[PDB]
């Protein structure tokens, strides 16, 4: 009586095409706030003058 199920399943078969195959996504949400930045890259820390 017109109350659809909000969820729906994906079909990931090995015979799927390039537009249907699964793609594992990892969105690295970077942010630049005024707080001390704890996440950094592997840059060699130098001395201080």
């Amino acid at each position, epitope marked *: *009586f*017109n109350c*659809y*199920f*909000p*969820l*729906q*399943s*994906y*079909g*990931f*078969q090995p015979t*799927n*095409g390039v*537009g*249907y195959q699964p793609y594992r996504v990892v969105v690295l949400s970077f942010e630049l706030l005024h707080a001390p930045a704890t996440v950094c890259g592997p840059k060699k820390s130098t001395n201080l003058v």
Partner: antibody
Amino acid sequence: QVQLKQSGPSLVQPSQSLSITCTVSGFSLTSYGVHWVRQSPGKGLEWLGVMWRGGNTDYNAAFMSRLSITKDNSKSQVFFKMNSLQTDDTAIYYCAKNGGAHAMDFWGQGTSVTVSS
Amino acid sequence: NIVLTQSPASLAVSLGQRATISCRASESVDSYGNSFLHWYQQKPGQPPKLLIYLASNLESGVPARFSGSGSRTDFTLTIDPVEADDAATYYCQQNNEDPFTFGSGTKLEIKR
């Protein structure tokens, strides 16, 4: 992996009843509501009914008083009881899995039920 | 009651062209938040399959050549390009009001 084929009827006369046995596989009966339709008897595709997940069931306006759905959750089989059939109702009857927006995602092979004296 | 007077009754579209299968409806609004419907396919030598759900989305197992959109009553199923997997009858189904009837059925013929 998925099987929704029908069987059970051989031949039926007009204005009589019958019983269909649709073997469900690939998904649990408590997870999706098995739909029930025909295969184009003359005019476009005809919809009959659907048994929801452990609740009530909807039927067609022209087949609510005659056709009924009997869903067996223990045997993983959905039985169908039809009454007062006409020769024009001859078509292949299908079972299908419920989708997200009440869609029919999977479809079976069905069985060609023939009505004739 | 919804009378899905789907038109045309049949098509003759050659390979590589665009086939248009319209579907006329009468009711209703707010299927999920809009006035879309589902599309299906019934092949003569293979069981049927679901092509498009909500008339705007792709389904696994079938190619992405099937697309389209639709208004409250003026719906459209676009098959572009036409390949050798389209010779079958196409239907449209509304599910926002009982009975969940289908369209009249457009028998697409591959015009080779």
